[PDB]
Design an enzyme around this catalytic site. Structure first.
Site, PDB file in Angstrom:
ATOM      1  N   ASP A 158       0.834  -1.214   0.000  1.00 17.20           N
ATOM      2  CA  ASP A 158       0.000   0.000   0.000  1.00 17.20           C
ATOM      3  C   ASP A 158       0.870   1.266   0.000  1.00 17.20           C
ATOM      4  OD1 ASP A 158      -2.345   1.680   0.034  1.00 17.20           O
ATOM      5  OD2 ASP A 158      -2.874   1.047   2.064  1.00 17.20           O
ATOM      6  N   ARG A 162      -0.106   9.024   1.288  1.00 18.01           N
ATOM      7  CA  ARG A 162      -0.726   8.928   2.629  1.00 18.01           C
ATOM      8  C   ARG A 162       0.074   8.071   3.628  1.00 18.01           C
ATOM      9  NH1 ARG A 162      -3.800   6.237  -1.129  1.00 18.01           N
ATOM     10  NH2 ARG A 162      -3.754   3.952  -0.893  1.00 18.01           N
ATOM     11  N   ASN A 163       0.812   7.090   3.124  1.00 20.52           N
ATOM     12  CA  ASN A 163       1.639   6.237   3.984  1.00 20.52           C
ATOM     13  C   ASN A 163       3.120   6.581   4.028  1.00 20.52           C
ATOM     14  OD1 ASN A 163      -0.621   4.815   4.712  1.00 20.52           O
ATOM     15  ND2 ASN A 163      -0.429   3.405   2.994  1.00 20.52           N
ATOM     16  N   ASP A 176       3.719   2.042   7.797  1.00 24.27           N
ATOM     17  CA  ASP A 176       2.725   1.018   7.526  1.00 24.27           C
ATOM     18  C   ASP A 176       3.243  -0.145   6.731  1.00 24.27           C
ATOM     19  OD1 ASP A 176       0.569   1.965   8.899  1.00 24.27           O
ATOM     20  OD2 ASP A 176      -0.680   2.259   7.101  1.00 24.27           O
TER      21      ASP A 176
END
Ligand SMILES: CN1CCN(c2ccc(NC(=O)c3n[nH]c4ccccc34)cc2)CC1
Length: 299
Positions: A158, A162-163, A176
């Protein structure tokens, strides 16, 4: 009962729990101060992010948090990842203590530094501003962190802006990467911010559930597109069903304005239909290193 690991255990009274940072089901994150985290002195306070579970939390939620902690232990330290700092595992709720990134995620970081709002946007006067050399540098650091993770045999699955988290000194750190398994991903689910995660997924990961480093390199392509549109949202207004069809036809995103052709060919390369033909993170780190050095910061 959890077993103690004296490599990582911080006494509970050495941690002062502060304001929340993040929610919710996937485990609450709070700001804290750790007294005497490092060998010496024990008299100094470090701002940390602490991961925990919520109230109505299951054993499976507990199991995942442990697994993510153990995974960070095995992966080891890198400048461009969220590093494990400590843990309180005994005589109370589980806290996993990790580095604090005070400027939040890269998407937010990118959006906040966009040029001022004109008549046609309108009072978005940012206090802060990123040159072309700054932007390529963000990409170099994320590729660096990814290369490190791949060398430790870790597949992110992912990768997206955002991560990626941003520290007070503007260092990019991948978050993450130690998250548990999860055969049960529903393409229809959204992010808090309204976007569909299917839109960073390689076709082979999306259609055949083949997750490799090559598939992560596909996601880094979209991450490059996110940095160069200053936190632009991929395929806005495209629902999952229509995204499937754009992928099937070999559709590829447009070149952002203020992006060199060389960087756009990098994006396109990362999006090669054939996974073996994509560049590796190692190649991307070499390429970016070269481009950064040649990228003017005067604009
Ligand atoms: C106005 N904005 C100011 C910046 N802000 C912000 C600032 C920092 C953070 N940081 C975090 O939530 C964070 N830092 N390290 C982590 C490790 C794992 C999971 C999360 C984290 C999150 C949000 C969001 C609101």
């Amino acid at each position: 009962e959890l077993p103690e690991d004296p490599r990582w255990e911080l006494p509970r009274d050495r941690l002062v729990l502060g304001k929340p940072l993040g929610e919710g089901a996937f485990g609450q994150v709070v700001l804290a101060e750790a007294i005497g985290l490092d060998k010496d002195k024990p008299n100094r306070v470090t701002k940390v992010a602490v991961k925990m579970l919520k109230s109505d939390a299951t054993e499976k939620d507990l199991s995942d948090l442990i697994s993510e902690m153990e995974m960070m232990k095995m992966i080891g330290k890198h400048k461009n990842i969220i590093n494990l700092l400590g843990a309180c595992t005994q005589d109370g709720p589980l806290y996993v203590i990790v580095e604090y990134a005070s400027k939040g995620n890269l998407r937010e970081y990118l959006q906040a530094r966009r040029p001022p709002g004109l008549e046609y946007s309108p009072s978005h006067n940012p206090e802060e501003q990123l040159s072309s050399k700054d932007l390529v540098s963000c990409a170099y650091q994320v590729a660096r962190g990814m290369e490190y993770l791949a060398s430790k045999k870790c597949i992110h699955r992912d990768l997206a802006a955002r991560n990626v988290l941003v520290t007070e000194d503007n260092v990019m750190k991948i978050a993450d990467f130690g998250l548990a398994r999860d055969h049960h991903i529903d393409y229809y689910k959204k992010t808090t911010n309204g976007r569909l995660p299917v839109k960073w997924m390689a076709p082979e990961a999306l259609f055949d559930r083949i997750y490799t480093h090559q598939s992560d390199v596909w996601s880094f392509g979209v991450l490059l597109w996110e940095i160069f549109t200053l936190g632009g949202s991929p395929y806005p207004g495209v629902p999952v069903e229509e995204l499937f069809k754009l992928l099937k036809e070999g559709h590829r995103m447009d070149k952002p304005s203020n992006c060199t052709n060389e960087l756009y060919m990098m994006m396109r390369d990362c999006w090669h239909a054939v996974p073996s033909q994509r560049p590796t993170f190692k190649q991307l780190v070499e390429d970016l290193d070269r481009i950064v050095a040649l990228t003017s910061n005067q604009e």
